[PDB]
Amino acid sequence: DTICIGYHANNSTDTVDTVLEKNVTVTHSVNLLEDSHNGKLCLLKGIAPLQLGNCSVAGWILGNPECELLISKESWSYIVETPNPENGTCYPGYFADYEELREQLSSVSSFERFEIFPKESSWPNHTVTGVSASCSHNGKSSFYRNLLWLTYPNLSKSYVNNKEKEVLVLWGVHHPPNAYVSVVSSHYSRRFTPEIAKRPKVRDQEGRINYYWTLLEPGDTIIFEANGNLIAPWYAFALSGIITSNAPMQTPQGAINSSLPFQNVHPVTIGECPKYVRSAKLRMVTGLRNIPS
Amino acid sequence: FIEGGWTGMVDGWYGYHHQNEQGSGYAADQKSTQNAINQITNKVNSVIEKMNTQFTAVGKEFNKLERRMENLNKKVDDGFLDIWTYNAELLVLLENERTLDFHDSNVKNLYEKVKSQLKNNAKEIGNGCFEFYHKCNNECMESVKNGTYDYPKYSEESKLNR
């Protein structure tokens, strides 16, 4: 013949906080802060990300000998680069307009390597050999893999963009520290000249050779020219996402598998991910207090 | 009132600890429990969603000759970080504050409900406890729980007897 009211209690702490008071226990709670980490970087979209460690993105695009050119990687959701580059630019030089290519190359997930120019037919009048001691591959002299040194006629050649896709073209000019090079697009022009000023020695090399790069769309055609020197292209990384890390086979420091909105791992990430926040504990209350009567 | 939850009555959120000459134990109340759990779960599902983001290539590079861009980018990023931190902290604290008082209000509502179910057949003692002047068997528990208490039926001896 007695009735009383009450609520359920248990033997768990699950500390939570509120304006009422800090460090108060609760019967049931849900945490909106995540800390899972150390997961090895896996396929974000079920595809192998473009890993090119031991070499810089520059040399990778420019056929550096060391990395063997990674001939076969059709699909790459994102690019992971070693935080400290190795042999990132074989020949000393001044690469201009940079980080524009880096930002451009953060989306395209498919490439069609395409030998733009013939290495056998359209230009035998001049020699193709040439090496640099500082660029001797595997202990033997060599120059590069993606583009061609040249060694005289007034070179005049042009692509036409027959394929209905954007075609990239990279090249440079020779700065001998001891020539009306003029890329010409339908709606883009420049006119560089050769320099002869003295240079300090770096990487055992006496000078530099600077590289440029232009983008052209379908229905366009670009015509080259040069007198004193030119670095002809030999392969266009036809188009159709940067993280620095050292972990083996997504965030710079691992992977996250959860549905919470907030993260404590380093903010930088790729793809849809929980928003980062600078906080320690964000636990929501979904039940009643827990203190024995 | 709210002092501390009993270790017993494993399942549920609210309930009653009936006692009678024949037996004693616990008993949960589903009607309020389901409402409370459903509402709280819906609120959690509401707050969790609405957070969606596209391909946010946060990492950006800037040349040696563009320190101005570096400073601008750092400014915008830190500002966004601070704004979101403050907003999220405030929201979570507010919801935590709003939940507990709601639970207490629901408990008080159940208390006044049971109080209304009958008036003078019992006598309040405190700590949210009641006792009947009369004596009733097990079934009167179910009768009160459903709210089907029949005041004239148990009006017997409902008078000064002590």
Epitope: D1, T2, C4, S293 | W6, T7, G8, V10, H17, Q19, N20, E21, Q22, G23, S24, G25, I125, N127, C129, E131, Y133, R162
Partner: antibody, heavy 109, light 86 residues
């Protein structure tokens, strides 16, 4: 805290040294050689009451508050009832929890 | 409900009881004195040498005489266990 007990038959357990009006008393019989056996209990107010399974009807319990004493009307003196009787008090005012802490000298009837 | 009985002891039941258990000790002549109340919580004042733990129809103490274990879940029909020789 202090408690005493003295004593068909009549038996009363007087006590003092606390708030007699805000607690529930009880009783426990003891066999000559066996363990203890519960016999009864009452709530603090004086309405709710219970009794031993094999005793309902004969042994009766009543309480007051002025003199802080309670009495059991030990009737129907069946000869098998030769059991040592005691007195005890609950350890808290909350209904769900229970334990007999304050234990008195008891009585040998 | 029913109870039974077997330094350490062992009190066994035939039903699930969460925490409504205690322990009572007594030597001949003197009235029983309180021991750890609750499932295992130690009562104050009394010497702390006595102790125990365990729950869920299985309880055990930890340390001549006699002791008792009592269950307080189904209230109206109280019950005290048996003896405990040592």
């Amino acid at each position: 805290v202090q408690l005493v007990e003295s004593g068909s038959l009549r038996l009363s357990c007087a006590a003092s040294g606390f708030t007699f009006s805000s607690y529930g008393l009880s009783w426990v019989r003891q066999a000559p050689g066996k363990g203890l056996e519960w016999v009864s209990y009452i709530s603090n107010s004086g309405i709710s009451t219970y009794y031993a399974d094999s005793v309902k009807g004969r042994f009766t319990i009543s309480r007051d508050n002025s003199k802080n004493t309670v009495s059991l009307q030990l009737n129907s003196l069946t000869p098998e009832d030769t059991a040592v009787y005691y007195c005890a008090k609950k350890g808290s005012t909350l209904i769900p929890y229970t334990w007999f802490d304050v234990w008195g000298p008891g009585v040998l009837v | 409900i029913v109870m039974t009985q077997s330094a350490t002891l062992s009190c066994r039941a035939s039903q699930s009881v969460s925490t409504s258990l205690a322990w009572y000790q007594q030597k001949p002549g003197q009235a029983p004195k309180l021991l750890i109340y609750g499932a295992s919580s130690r009562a104050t004042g009394i010497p702390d040498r006595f102790s125990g733990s365990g729950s869920g129809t299985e309880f055990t103490l930890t340390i001549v005489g006699v002791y008792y274990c009592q269950q307080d879940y189904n209230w109206p029909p109280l019950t005290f266990g048996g003896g405990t020789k040592v």
